[model samples]
Target: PSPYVEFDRRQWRALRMSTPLALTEEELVGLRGLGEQIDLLEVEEVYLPLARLIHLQVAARQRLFAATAEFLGEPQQNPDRPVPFIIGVAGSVAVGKSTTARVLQALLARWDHHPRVDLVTTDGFLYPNAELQRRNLMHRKGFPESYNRRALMRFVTSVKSGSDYACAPVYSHLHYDIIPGAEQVVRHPDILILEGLNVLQTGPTLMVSDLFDFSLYVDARIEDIEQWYVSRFLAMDSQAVVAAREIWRTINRPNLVENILPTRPRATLVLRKDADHSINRLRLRKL
Candidate 1:
């Protein structure tokens, strides 16, 4: 009765080619943020298979476009300008979606088909903390209401339009605000990974996911996420209650339950993580 074909780690790993992609030991050395060390084995096991799947999806989309063009008797969209495939990655706060996107961005570039990959996070679209204070949404920062939905959608639309470049505002977690005069520009990426907390938010009309060529959700149980959140911030406040726990209970948890988690089923594929922060399973939406 499920719309998905679930695969335990081994089964999904088997979807990958038998020969590995010989990733260097230091391939992701500095890429892993938050002091989380990346084991090349993890890439070989979890991400390589995912990369292969994406490669196929990209090829199929191009084929479909060409076939449709022929059927319509129209000139191909543009021989000099190919559409960029948009891969949206989303998850709960502190659920490691950022790191996951970075890993994929690095590995996907190795593929010859779509070697130029760009990543842009939706955090940049969040209202600046100043605007939050003005709007009195500081406590509800990560909620869907806190983002500038129209502008966010506009950015993605420009990318989909095959514009020369699309730019997004820069957001700084440390400064707790949008950086003034700073922007992240994405220009003709072969693939664009739009990573964020709620890029897949199901809207009343014209949702962001509508523009996605493919999407992925990095998933884990709430309890496991709580522990991961605590550990990620333990260095800052040994008393978890003072920082991590308080915020999770008040802000992140509610956003996850009501806004973000609901979008999990909307993803084209999901990588489910174990309590140890390693992915143990993957489930793909049935075609």
Candidate 2:
């Protein structure tokens, strides 16, 4: 009746049936984000099944395309020009969306059909620090207005259009800006994972979400997210504690409330993370 069904932690783990753990602790160490700790069991219970689901969905889509092409007498469409599956991972800052996307990227590639999985973060689409300074938006870095929405739309559209390759500018957290003249190339990936705060959001007319084959929204209580955000940066120098608190209170929380959380219902799957960073529940929208 709700058009969405819930899965408790154990219930979702049960769905992992027979999906082997294809990742290692070492690999996970690199994928994990600051103050966001996830164990291998979490991957086995939460992500393995997710990877399997995406893999099967991609296969089914490929079959559908092939059959349709043949029915229409287009002989040139087989596996060579197989459509790339586009997956968008969206959530608020410090909500562990990056970890979810990276883990999925690592596992989804294990499946034979989608062996070439590549991830692109929308961080690169954020306007350069100089541009933000020009527009007096440095304090609103993670908000929707902080990004070059038009460029991001074109990048995702090109990849979903089955382009041979697509390039995105590089963003550097250390420098807190877009790296000049640096780009990350995605070369016809079998699957493309786009991770960002507002990837699922819809604009007035055209949206990058229109190009996603599937999308995920990472979710958590705002209190938990703020605490985690504080803890991560609090570990830095003493001055960073003040900066973190101010940023969270003034910028990040508002963006999450006004922009990010509104798109949760738009995701095909919503994963809610506990304070410990373990996925406590999953909600899948009914097909």
Candidate 3:
């Protein structure tokens, strides 16, 4: 009846191989997001196994692709050709998706199999502030409708098609908008981690998950997420720019309920975190 094979942290850690940690304490601090505390032990227990699983998936996909080509009577794909494995990391705001993506990117790259790993967030694909204001969607910023779905789809399409280079618009968190004329170029990475709130959404016409080889969803209770969102807002607002309570009440909470939480079932792996922000449970979709 259930689609997932559930594991508590202890059980999950038991699944990990004898993989060495590739990051230092200082690097882990830098990779962690505001108001989130992640240490090397958590990385070893949670992400190391995840990275190993992804490595296995990548290898399996490569073999399947080659076998399919042979079956079709086509020449073998050049080993040098770039075939990127795309990963989607999705969750509600303040659920620690960014930190998860960054951690996975570092660990996966450190794996000898895939040395090149890059991360691109969906924030860059969001409509510019000016356009959002013009369309009267400024208040609805992180909602699915606020992004340039067509452009985002095009960018992923190019990446999946093995284009030599794919460029995504640059987003500035300080300015809270897309930077005009600036681009984040993704060149032939062995793995591309796309992190965002709506990365797993199934749209009316097309779904972003269609391009993803694997997907992860970071999940927490609504109350816990709201608290985390407010905490992050306060931590980042050193100057006290905006009231945390107001933002949570007006923007983040609604977006989570209406747009983000519904996509949790779509992920290949669901990471459920505790109130202290440690991953306590991992629900893996059954093969």
What value of lDDT does candidate 3 attain over all alpha carbons?
0.85
What digit string (tens of lDDT, one per residue) describes model 1 on residues 1-287? 99999999877667646555666544565345334457677877777767877888887877777787667677645444467899999999888898888888877776677788898988899998889999999999988889999999999999998887799999987887899889899888889999998798988988999999899999999999988888777855356656889988999999999999999999999989998888898889998
Better of 2 and 3 by TM-score: 2
Q: Candidate 1: deviation at residue 150, Å? A: 0.9
Pairs with steric clashes in candidate 2: none
Report how far off residue 81 is in candidate 3 (Å): 2.8
Worst 10 residues of 3 by lDDT: 27-36
Candidate 3's residue-wise lDDT over 1-287, tens digit each? 89999999878767645756455654455455333456767886678778788888988887787787667667555444447999999998999898899888876776566788899999999999999999999999989889999999999999988887999999998999999999999998989999998998889888888999999999988888888887777776444435776777798889888888889999999999999889999999998
Residue 124 Cα positional deviation in candidate 2, in Å, after optimal superposition: 0.4
TM-score, per-candidate, Cα-based: 0.91, 0.91, 0.89
Worst 10 residues of 1 by lDDT: 25-34
Q: Mind giving the per-residue lDDT tens digits that candidate 2 earns over 45-65?
A: 778777777888999987887
Q: Provide the overall lDDT of each model, using Cα atoms, as 2-decimal numbers.
A: 0.84, 0.85, 0.85
